[PDB]
Symmetry: D2
Subunit: 117 residues, 4 copies
């Protein structure tokens, strides 16, 4: 949406990774992971609309990209259960975050692009 | 060294990532993460001797590489709290699991190299 | 533009890589590299308008991303002279190609996203 | 093994990339690429003994990893012709150069690990 976007690419096919489930959690006061938002990537491999400026407060967030479910639906047995992307957000004020992930059956890469709006 | 090894490289300095704390967890029947093994990477960026064949049974494992503290010790501002690598140990495949992680302040990749002696 | 786009990210700063020079070559009949197109990445780290559907014929192309010039302008001494991305294009008909590159001082990654228009 | 080593991993199969042809060139005074050294990766994905301290003088070097043929031998359709790694050898820094390449059909990364004995 505005504050948090996720974009996933498939390194085997050289294509957007479509229909990839994404779960976002936020660390609570008791140090447990509270469900914060979720969704799926579109045809373009992008997931917009996860949250709002209002809801996306300071905190430690975990973005779980369900890579195994993605590869299995393509008849592939991958190594990882999911990608995890854990980071502190907005601790110097609001930012826009794009979490990019590149997927291969035994590997993935991830990159944060952080903009000041 | 044997069943499980972790190797970490620093993409900013073109070096092994030395003295990086690494924690391994095993998923418990109640879906909590139980501490399993840990250590710090060597001068060569490697962490050997985390577990044994006997101890390393099939199951879901999480490897956390404490990248934020690594970068902070170098006076470099990082994005991630840590790199996570989550996977299922399988007895069908090759016997050796090497988790390799390539670190940048706002990006990391990880690959699993699964081999036989 | 339409047929060939280049997008570059900075893994140290978690930002688009701005003002990155890009040179594209095409292998000639005599197996030498003919200059084909060039440009620079914009504020968004993207380079559009390199070529047209008419000019972008079948062939072997080389996309040179001038990473050393990029890092030097930021006071950094990197390892690589430039990224090279060499590939056969349009050998099964016209496609759209996006060449993505992620830059660190001692490392880079690249990924092709290929669409059928 | 000594001054220059090349190591290659397969991100699709989670293995060393075996029997991969690797060519090293040195830039000549007329900006042509002169063949310098070559070989094929071992069972461990490594290529040692390319050059000697005596032979490996300062200059610009290009390492070409013949990835297209690697993937074709596995019946996997690749994007790149080859992976290129271009850099300047420097006597000021550490004495050992390890070029590591992580391969996917439509993506590759490469990092330089520059160390001392
Ligand atoms: O994830 C990584 O760090 C590797 O690069 N991934 C990129 C990615 C993923 C999804 C959408 C766009 C990208 C992208 C764009 C430019 C450079 C690198 C990347
Ligand atoms: O981390 C990744 O998956 C990217 O590649 N990483 C490699 C790595 C990390 C630590 C130690 C050795 C490596 C390595 C060796 C050859 C090819 C790729 C890689």
């Amino acid at each position: 949406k505005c504050p948090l976007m996720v974009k996933v690419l498939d390194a085997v096919r050289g294509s957007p990774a479509i229909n990839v489930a994404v779960h976002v959690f936020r660390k609570a006061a008791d140090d447990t992971w509270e469900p914060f938002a979720s969704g799926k990537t579109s045809e373009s491999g992008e997931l917009h609309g996860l949250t709002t400026e209002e809801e996306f407060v300071e905190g430690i967030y975990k973005v779980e990209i369900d890579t195994k479910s993605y590869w299995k639906a393509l008849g592939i047995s991958p190594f990882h259960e999911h990608a995890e992307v854990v980071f502190t957000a907005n601790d110097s004020g609001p930012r826009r975050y794009t979490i990019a992930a590149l997927l291969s059956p035994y590997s993935y890469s991830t990159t944060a692009v952080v903009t000041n709006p």
